[PDB]
DNA sequence: TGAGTTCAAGGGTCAAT
DNA sequence: ATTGACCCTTGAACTCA
C-alpha cells in the first residue's frame, strides 16, 4: 500500500504518484484544491518555510511552491466531475 | 446531537478525541497552543457545567483531560487568514 | 496505479466580554 | 487579554477505469 514511497514535498507516507510526483494524499489533495479553484497564497514570512508532515499547513504559499518545485503538473489536474 | 463530555452543554461533534462543544474545543486548542498552566483557587473540584465552566480554567483543564481529550491532537498553528 | 470523491475533524475569525 | 458561534481546509478512505 504505501510501503515503498515518500512524499517528495512533506516526507509523509505515499502510495503512489500524483500529479508526476510521489507524494501523500494532503499534498495530492491540496494541490487538487488549489488549482481546481485557482487559489492565490500568500507568505507571511520569508518564503522558505519548512515543508514536513508537521509544518506543511503552516504556509500554503510554500507548500505549493514545493509540489512545483518537486515536479507536480497542474494539467494533470482534471475538471471537477459534474 | 450529542451533549459536550466535559460542560454537559451541546455538541458538535468529537474534538481531540471527545464529544464536546465549540467552548471546550476552542478553550482546549488554546491551553494547548500557548501550553498554558492554570492553578485552582480553591479544592481542585470545581463544577463545569454549562454556565460555571469559565469560572476555573485549571479545573476545566483537568476535566477535558479526563474525559479523553488528546493534546497531541492539537496541531501548529496555522498563518493569520 | 492514478484519476476521481466525501465529510469528520482539523483549522481560523472576530464581536462580545 | 479569553470565549465560542460560525465558517473554511485538510486528508484518510473510498470508487472507478
Ligand atoms: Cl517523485
Ligand atoms: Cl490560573
Ligand atoms: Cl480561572
Ligand atoms: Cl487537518
Ligand atoms: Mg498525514
Ligand atoms: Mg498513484
Ligand atoms: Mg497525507
Ligand atoms: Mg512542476
Ligand atoms: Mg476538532
Ligand atoms: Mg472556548
Ligand atoms: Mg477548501
Ligand atoms: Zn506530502
Ligand atoms: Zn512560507
Ligand atoms: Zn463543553
Ligand atoms: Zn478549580
Do not use: P
Not at 507524494?23 to 488549482?35: A, D, I, L, P
Not at 520569508?46 to 500554503?60: V, Y
Amino acid at each position: 500500500m504505501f510501503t515503498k514511497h515518500i512524499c517528495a514535498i512533506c516526507g509523509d507516507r505515499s502510495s503512489g504518484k500524483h500529479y508526476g510526483v510521489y507524494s501523500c494524499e494532503g499534498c495530492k489533495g491540496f494541490f487538487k484544491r488549489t488549482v481546481r479553484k485557482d487559489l492565490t497564497y500568500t507568505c507571511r514570512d520569508n518564503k522558505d518555510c519548512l515543508i514536513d508532515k508537521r509544518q506543511r499547513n503552516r504556509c500554503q504559499y510554500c507548500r505549493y511552491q514545493k509540489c512545483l518545485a518537486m515536479g507536480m503538473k497542474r494539467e494533470a489536474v482534471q475538471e471537477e466531475r459534474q
